[model samples]
Target chain A: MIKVEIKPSQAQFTTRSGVSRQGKPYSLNEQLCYVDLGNEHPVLVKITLDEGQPAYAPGLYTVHLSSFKVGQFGSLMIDRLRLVPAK
Target chain B: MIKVEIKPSQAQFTTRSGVSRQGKPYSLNEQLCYVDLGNEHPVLVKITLDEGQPAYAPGLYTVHLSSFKVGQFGSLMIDRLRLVPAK
Candidate 1:
């Protein structure tokens, strides 16, 4: 339930290569952003967009911290994203 | 580069179901632990032990925070684990 502000410049569109749950090769285009967790520093967060879901614009978002999954390399994954109106 | 202490009671041994990179169904028995990140709270960390690697005993460990990956559900994943001798 952690909320953080993310600017458009803080996000990068990229593709991640991996196998699907069925074991098929797949590459998913995802949004990668650096989000401040109010801790020591910002952590790299990967946002997966559902089919037909629009890209996220610069604004405040309610980050589901529990949805974060640490990767073997160094990136973190967020299941989904919700943008909140900036005050 | 963050390190944390993990006790034996904090770890759980279990199997996770998933497809391999080649698309084959597989189950891997792994060690799951709750590790304090010096943040809001401790995070659930998944440890994948390599072949011939012995199970971790009760002790302190130097957690590699960079290896964390956020999962779609809520659990986090850590690529590997290393134990450090307690002072």
Candidate 2:
């Protein structure tokens, strides 16, 4: 499981790929960045900045079973991940 | 903006010191882990694990404005983060 606490500064927390949050039926174009296991193949998922919004800085985040399968990528880390409130 | 991807392994991504999904009203105990800028005062926010669930593996995630204001920590990274999916 991966837990994250965001404290946006000079931008907003947002992502591509998924409809609302970065989830389900993954793709390549504008997909949210994330880790994809280690031994098999450690990859640092990357996303793009769509827009900005007002949200709680120093906010907390976490990733559970939503994708409970990656090993190496899971250990890498979620740095520079920002997201705008779901709308 | 920061990007992250996760593929859970044997455990789940979880956190504490907040409502659900590691949100507002942050605290210390069981708080989600994250970076707090670099130069100013780099600190890795740590959280705890909860239960488990069945969602998506090889999942992609990203962090943005939600806390768009952390520098040192932000520059750090979200390694070893895990959550157990909201109840």
Candidate 3:
């Protein structure tokens, strides 16, 4: 099984853009990074540590995500998140 | 800031599929989940914890993704990933 942990102090963030179904221009602010889990494919994720705290490194990390939003897409339509290490 | 934590004992997993740009059918074995981060957009991600520990609940989690591959797409053509919780 894949093991996991989050370290808020080491979180990183970035952003990218893509077009939506409505043909509208929007930007995606992604708090993401790369982790090398010795797998086949690449694993890129926009995440948060402890909940909204943290990537471009291909290693391991402890991070969190504040929130995601689209330029005109309005609300992302989701729930609450607070990711903390499981003791 | 968003907080994060991963509990191997409570990790969850599942899979989904989608097509690629080559018009080929591929399956996405996603170990993903819903995290209630109290945000506008929904937070859905496939992750591995500690290095591959693991989701479906709308809260935060500790996970690690093994690898992402397509049926006939050959390889994901990227780097590696290992999402471990931070200290």
Indicate which candidate wins on DockQ.
3
Query: Interface RMSDs of all predictions?
Result: 9.2, 12.8, 10.0
lDDT of 1 by residue, A3-70 (tens): 45556885655666667576676766677555554466765566666556755776677554444556
Answer with 1 or 2, whichever has the higher lDDT: 1
TM-score to true structure, per model: 0.37, 0.23, 0.26
Q: How many backbone clashes are present in model 2?
A: 74
Clashes of each: 11, 74, 74
Q: Looking at candidate 2, what is the lDDT of residue B72?
A: 44
The CAPRI category of model 2 is incorrect
Highest lDDT: which candidate?
1
Model 1 chain B is weakest, by summed lDDT over 10 consecutive residues, at B73-82
What is the lDDT ranking, best to worst? 1, 3, 2
State the lDDT of candidate 3 residue by residue for B46-77, as single tens digits: 44323333343333444233322222212121
lDDT of 2 by residue, B18-46 (tens): 45355545432332223333234323333
DockQ for candidate 3:
0.10
